Amino acid sequence: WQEDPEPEDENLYEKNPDSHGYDKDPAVDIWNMRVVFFFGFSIVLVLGSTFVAYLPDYRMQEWARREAERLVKYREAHGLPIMESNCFDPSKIQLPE
Amino acid sequence: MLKYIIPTIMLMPLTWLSKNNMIWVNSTAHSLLISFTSLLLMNQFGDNSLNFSLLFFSDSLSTPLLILTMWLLPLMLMASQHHLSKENLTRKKLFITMLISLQLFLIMTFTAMELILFYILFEATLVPTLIIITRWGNQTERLNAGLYFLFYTLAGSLPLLVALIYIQNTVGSLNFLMLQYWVQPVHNSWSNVFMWLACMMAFMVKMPLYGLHLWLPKAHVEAPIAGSMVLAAVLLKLGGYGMLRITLILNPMTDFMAYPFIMLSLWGMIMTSSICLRQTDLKSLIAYSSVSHMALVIVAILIQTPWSYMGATALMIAHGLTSSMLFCLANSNYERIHSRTMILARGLQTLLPLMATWWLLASLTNLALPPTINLIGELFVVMSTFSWSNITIILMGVNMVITALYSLYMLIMTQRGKYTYHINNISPSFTRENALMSLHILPLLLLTLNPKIILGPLY
Amino acid sequence: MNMFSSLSLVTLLLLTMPIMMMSFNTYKPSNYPLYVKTAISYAFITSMIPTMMFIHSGQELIISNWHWLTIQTLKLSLSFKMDYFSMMFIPVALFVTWSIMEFSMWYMYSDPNINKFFKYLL
Amino acid sequence: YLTHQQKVLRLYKRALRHLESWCIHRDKYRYFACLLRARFDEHKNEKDMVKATQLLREAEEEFWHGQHPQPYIFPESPGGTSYERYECYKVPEWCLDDWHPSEKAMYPDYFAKREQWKKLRRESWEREVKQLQEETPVGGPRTEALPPARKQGDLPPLWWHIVTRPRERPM
Amino acid sequence: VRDHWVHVLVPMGFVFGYYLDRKNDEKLTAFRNKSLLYKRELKPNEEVTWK
Amino acid sequence: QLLYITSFVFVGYYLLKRQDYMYAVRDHDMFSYIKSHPEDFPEKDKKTYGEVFEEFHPVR
Amino acid sequence: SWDKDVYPEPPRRTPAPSPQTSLPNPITYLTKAFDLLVDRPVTLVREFIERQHAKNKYYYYHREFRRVPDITECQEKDVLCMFEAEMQWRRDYKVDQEIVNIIQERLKACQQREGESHRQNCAKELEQFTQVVKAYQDRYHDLGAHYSARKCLAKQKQRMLAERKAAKEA
Amino acid sequence: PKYEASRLSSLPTTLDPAEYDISSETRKAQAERLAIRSRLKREYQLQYYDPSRRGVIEDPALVRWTYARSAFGIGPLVFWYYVFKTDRDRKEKLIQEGKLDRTFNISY
């Protein structure tokens, strides 16, 4: 058949020794590096890591600890078991038979 | 979820209405902004899930998978734009559109309350994924890879549809919040055995379960880089996410029905890890590595313990970044030497010193060095399966040894030794490539500082 | 207590500082090996103080400074054990490592990656 | 592939090296080396070549029984402790092509001289290919031997990767 | 600006998405200040407990 | 392009009216039948979970 | 800074110095250097910061959850009641996890504090740890990853039936 | 004592009885082997030394190898199934009887 020959591979560095590898046009190439570095590293990674570091008591594990401290204090001051085996009051349960 | 659905949809007009030479800048920049806002999904509560509406919700399982999904889109754009540079403008925009449409289906899939809605979206991901592979793969057998990928999925997904519709008729609803309260035990009967298999086999194929895994290496060897990235990092986890949800309504039948799949997983992880020691295609080696890692996830889900579910969640996130990074590393070599043969280009640390460091870090996370979230997830599963049966520690420990062996074998073969004499086109690493590698590993390692956000609902 | 616990942690934090400076904050490539060797020699001195307090009165303590993760009923914290074995081993290890780095400054003098060699030893 | 003469001479050298590994001390080695030589000199003039092959075969059976299990190896020989030690520092010369212009500017004299070599290479290549065509029989080379240059101004065919190979101690 | 008008599309999509998420909560107010857990008396200047 | 949008909306609006009407009729039929046949739709007596027995299946 | 009843410590007994040597104690002079060179400048920075903090005193509160009916009082499939009971049970489950964590912290502090005498002197902590773990195990162990107040109740009723049978056979 | 070759330790060439009886047929075969090697060497060298070439010299032998290579199934599953099933039946039996110690076991 009639078909084009395979193109030869092109080295971005030959025309643009300063290439960042994003585009053959140097102005576009530089802009594309800047958005990736800014929106990728400066925003998402830096500010996103800061946002995660300061989440307000993620899934109440700090509240649970404070609440556990409040109950341990109360139960020991009143001679109660720290924890009971039964999760639910037996009086509210009607067993079969 | 509309604050994520709509701006994702708007990426399409952005790409089509951009100046010809700005399509990668604009799509990449704005997809990164969507990824930033995805962190608002971290408003999770200890008791209740974050229930937006009648259609969508987000708990601690879906949130990390959503963030990973939206993080992966800009990375795929960065990874794709070089080998698509000669493509004509319309076909470039169509390629970006497939990636955007994949994100749209994925974030809806991970947040649907009702299981039929999850099913339709779960199935819809097939279309852009198949089109990405068969249209933009390089080799002849991408056509076969598409058919294997398409028909493995539908061989399992059609029974799932029948089971889902059957469950709604019996229970009255498939809203996942309703199922949590109206779930009833599954008694022993041949009918329930096939209901169980219909509810599970579709997700097993996706993971993929050992013995249903041969589509995966075929798919990876044919896919373009973006295809492998999304496939390895997110699409496999659709099956993991599906199993974690649907096992709710399969007790207590999972007690004995899990055995044959646990055996396949426990033995399969050793088999696939060993196979990696003899793989000659770098992409095929990474594909088999995924099978081995996902075998742990299947075991974790099936034994259904709080520790195993936490490990499964961490493993799914950790594997997604690690495996995606490895395909990107493998692809960076390929874009120079145009071959996936692992033994072709050796001693690359001499020629590309900083890319050798990325290879080193990706390998270290792949073999689960403490305290990477890769090890955290693996360790939690190993902890929990020991209680399930102490003898499992033998298979778990042996798999750790083999994983270290093939992970470092990859590193030694490609990066160390002598360089191949006749390969004289190993040009210095581009800024784009270095940024791409660092945009995988840095967030992965930063997650070590705060693992709790990837441990899932059982945390 | 406060001198004992502060100085035992300073020993560890001091050793990591040459690794952090590799991020180029205040980095002198010209003699990085001398910099690494000096930190080892200073860490040895700082560790001899809590060792001396242990030898004197048998002072021992545990530092659980950072709560890293809680898995239901398993709380994981970064926790350091300044006891008999650590108080005696650390000064010895630092003293031996101090000699080896000084030896290394001569043995590996011609290695073009001598800087990386000292980072890896550290 | 090896002649009988080559096999005997290879065995003598191999036997002497293992004997030195055993003797260690120079005076002891000198004594036993001369005895070993006298064993080879005994059968030096054996003209019956079937007998000569028997002598060598038994000699190699003797060597295999008496060899040192841990013989001395020169440090940079294959199997020695410094073998390939410096390969990581060997960098092929084409890598300089990719240097940034600011890096090349640090060595203006070196890179001007490098351009002359690259010009010498380009202008010589066609004559090298032609010389090899003229001197290679129809079937192709029967051996790996390469010829010298035959005229003035010609370079020996296929010289670049020999002449410009990395230094043994490149850094 | 014909040069950069396309850069408001995804930001506007987010604002519209945010607004529609809020409008949907207005349809799910059947238990506002009525759950046994959180029900209370309204503060003097309060119309609704959340919106 | 304008007539394409207009034609779809015009036809779509009427199709949505009949759609919503047909579901209203279905519901009207269903509730009338339940009222006409109270013996087939008894108000079942509901137990609390303290009273109902559910087997426990340990996950060990 | 914390409740001494929740995280108790016994009164501390430090012996006085009793030198039997004329040589100076290096630790005593290093201690004085540490006070002058480390503690005082550290204390000066802290007091400046606290002075800024006193100009802006604002408060946060510990959230209080009213009690709602348990899963035992919920009619079958009544999701509105089940939901509130389920959420309450989940909050209690997290609290009980931290109660165990408090008791384990007490035990570990005693072990370190008592030194070579821990085996005898930490018996009271060991006993309290043993009991809370048993109660915690009874409530929550073996429920599985899909735990719920329903499954928790099913376990208690199974335990109650085994205890009723054993008492009857006696 | 003669050398016994093994799969992982070959017969030395100096001890191989076929290394000392080299006939005209054997020499002819060695020359044919050297000729094949030399022809491939030249074909490789004309590209490797070509100053205008930048890239990879594709090796059909390497391609054939990867192509050929890219082109005990229930027994261990059954074996492992009975190992874990037998272990878990034994363990479950003891817990129901109370004979398994789980005093401090509250993580799973």
Ligand SMILES: CCCCCCCCCCCCO[C@@H]1O[C@H](CO)[C@@H](O[C@H]2O[C@H](CO)[C@@H](O)[C@H](O)[C@H]2O)[C@H](O)[C@H]1O
């Ligand atoms: C009445 C109901 C229908 C409502 C329709 C509302 C939208 C109407 C849009 C009309 C304007 C279309 O604009 C016409 O098409 C495209 C994009 O716009 C422009 O041309 C385009 O070329 C390339 C893309 O191929 C890019 O540089 C850029 O996207 C744009 O310049 C044309 O130069 C313009 O003439």
Ligand SMILES: CCCCCCCCCCCCO[C@@H]1O[C@H](CO)[C@@H](O[C@H]2O[C@H](CO)[C@@H](O)[C@H](O)[C@H]2O)[C@H](O)[C@H]1O
């Ligand atoms: C990779 C695929 C893995 C596949 C794993 C296959 C697991 C096979 C499980 C076998 C058990 C099937 O479920 C079994 O069905 C029969 C239906 O007759 C039920 O038994 C029922 O029918 C039989 C008739 O023979 C009656 O004697 C019995 O009284 C009745 O209850 C059993 O109570 C149930 O245990």
Ligand SMILES: CCCCCCCCCCCCO[C@@H]1O[C@H](CO)[C@@H](O[C@H]2O[C@H](CO)[C@@H](O)[C@H](O)[C@H]2O)[C@H](O)[C@H]1O
């Ligand atoms: C709400 C958050 C939104 C964040 C969106 C981030 C997108 C960032 C994309 C930056 C790419 C800019 O890339 C390019 O830079 C300058 C902008 O003056 C312009 O480049 C040129 O355009 C014309 C002349 O041709 C001049 O007006 C301009 O001074 C000149 O620099 C291009 O028109 C623009 O395409």
